[PDB]
Amino acid sequence: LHKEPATLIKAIDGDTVKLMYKGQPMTFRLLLVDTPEFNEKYGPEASAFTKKMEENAKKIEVEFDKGQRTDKYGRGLAYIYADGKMVNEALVRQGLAKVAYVYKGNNTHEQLLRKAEAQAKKEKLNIWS
Numbered sequence: 001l002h003k004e005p006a007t008l009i010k011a012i013d014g015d016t017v018k019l020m021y022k023g024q025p026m027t028f029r030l031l032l033v034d035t036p037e038f039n040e041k042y043g044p045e046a047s048a049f050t051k052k053m054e055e056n057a058k059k060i061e062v063e064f065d066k067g068q069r070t071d072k073y074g075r076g077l078a079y080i081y082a083d084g085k086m087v088n089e090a091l092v093r094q095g096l097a098k099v100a101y102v103y104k105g106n107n108t109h110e111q112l113l114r115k116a117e118a119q120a121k122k123e124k125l126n127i128w129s
């Protein structure tokens, strides 16, 4: 896998974001995670977390996996990096997302993320409290 450029257009919520990629606006859905919707418990904290991480980043990058790059809604499916730190992993590590939607062939970072969730669960953080 490799990282490619993008620039933030607008924060949306925990596991979605509007980015410019190859000069086109697109909504990205983060691979392998599920954040609460804004209206749910920890929804507002998830959105805050990614909003800060995304907006404060100097360099946003996207990393597609080996499988489908867009979902049925036209959302890009990627790992998103803020100044080299994966947002997807950071959310899981903080107990603000669950590992989820693990589909065969788009699951390169599964075990990295599961290791983060186990550590979040141990710390009884957020969702796991």
Ligand SMILES: Cc1cn([C@H]2C[C@H](OP(=O)(O)O)[C@@H](COP(=O)(O)O)O2)c(=O)[nH]c1=O
Pocket: 015, 029, 030, 031, 032, 033, 034, 071, 072, 077, 101, 103, 106
């Ligand atoms: C994360 C991800 C979600 N999806 C689809 C499955 C779910 O379908 P349904 O909309 O039919 O439930 C939906 C969940 O996204 P959200 O958690 O953003 O709602 O997005 C994919 O198809 N591939 C993926 O890698």
Ligand SMILES: [Ca+2]
Pocket: 015, 034, 035, 036, 037
């Ligand atoms: Ca969600």
